[PDB]
Amino acid sequence: MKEFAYSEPCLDKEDKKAVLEVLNSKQLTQGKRSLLFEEALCEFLGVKHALVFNSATSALLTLYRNFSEFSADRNEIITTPISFVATANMLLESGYTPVFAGIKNDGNIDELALEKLINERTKAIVSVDYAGKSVEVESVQKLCKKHSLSFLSDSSHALGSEYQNKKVGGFALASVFSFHAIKPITTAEGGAVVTNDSELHEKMKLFRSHGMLKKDFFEGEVKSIGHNFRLNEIQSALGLSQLKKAPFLMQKREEAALTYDRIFKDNPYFTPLHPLLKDKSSNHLYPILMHQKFFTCKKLILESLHKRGILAQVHYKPIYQYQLYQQLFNTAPLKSAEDFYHAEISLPCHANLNLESVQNIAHSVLKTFESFK
């Protein structure tokens, strides 16, 4: 039986050639390819600076630790409960208490529900471009300016996404991208922080690699801590090769999304989010939102989809529901987050899905919902 993962990496012979070139060289890390990849990200995104890391989680920690010195008096960061747990775990590791905001129908943080959460301890707002869809950037920027907060963007899903016809990446103090295996482009594992703030770039650069600044070949200085979150040359070769075809890969996903939209239009069972886009999206996910009448049988629906070879997944359990977060914060549930979680299903959406497969999957999803009643 043909099984469709919700996302998968999409490598070609050119990617493989790029990796082989590195294997033939004596420079497997700390080399020219990572630099080339960073420079290409700057040009693609129209930003001043980029740094690549072993994962977006390492990138998040690096950004959270470096965007400001920590103060115990300014320890709260407003963020969304509908993200992967990393967005919040790295807040905890950086000394910050996450303050969870309501979300909208489209999974994104509700820009109209943020101001009420701001108090004297608030340091920043961390938004997530859910499924690739840009948040309401102008609203968030203005609120952050008004209240002297930093705007940080977890854009892990959103490489190539746009807001008002400009690339996501340059709108916040800094933005994070992920190159995990199933992301818009991949380095197997990887991430990036991009920014227009040179001092922040320089701080993060040192934090990524031991805090070491070399005086000459033989001696360095370490003024502040750092780790080893570097991206090696093999992965950087892969990343650059993938980035060079990022618009192509994104459009393959857009083509799939448009086909789902056509077959799904006005169906009574669930609502796709993709038709509601106002700007280009990376289309990392293709979310559908089930009618509330299906909430209690969701496990049976997911199991039925999997039995048909449609390996759908849910993004995401509200972060505050996890035991760690309940233990530390005893957070009251947010209706918007709970309803979204109950409704959401992510369907197969990646650059290697042909339209015949998408058509078959789409009709099979409809038949699945019809079979329940």
Add this chain to the structure above:
Amino acid sequence: MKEFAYSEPCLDKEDKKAVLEVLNSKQLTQGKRSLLFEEALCEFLGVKHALVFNSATSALLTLYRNFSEFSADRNEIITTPISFVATANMLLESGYTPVFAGIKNDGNIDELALEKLINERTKAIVSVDYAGKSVEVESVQKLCKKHSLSFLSDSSHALGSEYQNKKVGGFALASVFSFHAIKPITTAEGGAVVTNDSELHEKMKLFRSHGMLKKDFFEGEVKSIGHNFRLNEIQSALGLSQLKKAPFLMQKREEAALTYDRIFKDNPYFTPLHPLLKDKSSNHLYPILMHQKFFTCKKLILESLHKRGILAQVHYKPIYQYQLYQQLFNTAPLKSAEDFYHAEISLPCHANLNLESVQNIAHSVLKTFESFKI
């Protein structure tokens, strides 16, 4: 020209084949190859558990954070000032104050100078197998047991090294290895924590990947934080393939070391450490220690070596000399560490350095020293 880096990666066709097979798969991370690599490490070392990480620095942080819950009352960890800075930086990141011990002529922590440093705040001792040479494991084990401290081993240089005919890796509560490009074997960047403590293994495993426990395909649980320090499948395939020939690569480095030993025997300028080994070493480095008369002209000597294409390096600046450590602590310099740093030069030594190359480098090193009058 002809330039010799002090170490380099040594990949062959099997390694390249292994990587390419992964690229043909849909599973580029969180797959079977990292598990196979971990199992192969356990078989190679004779240990219960292995976990691979994106770097040894990630491995060190994971070990330091998880071997014990942190207590402000038990915040000191004794370690060596002659290591790469990561060994100590990850202590700071885990809440610990490093307490620097003296070292011996071979670069290793002085096991006879540790007990005097122990007090009510001491939590652990972190040793480093400098250049691949095992520290005096039995001495340190006994001391840690006596004082209820954890023995942690930064064995980053030492995959394949032995102590009393047993592989380094199983002697401490846990040990770290590095698979950086220039290390005994490589995954480009990578590291491992190995341990015989199952509870510690399971804690580190969650810390490596988000704290995530999966209930089913659809839902997980998080009871404690974690990061994403995973080693992907491409690098794990490389690691497995390299590990299969680790003894071969180690023996190539041993042959190079023996060639230097022959040419340097009874030379008037410096003392190689390699002839003093009592057990098999990974031979990650080939250190020589200059006569004190050359300390004041060391930079010129190093520059002369480099002009001859011998890209020698020094391991290591005493860690307490770094600005960060000077600002945080008031560390009196340690004569043993200062003298070692002033004396030491690491010469090219890796599995692809052929006999003719070693003979040429060795004769050039001698010529360089000869050129420096008083």
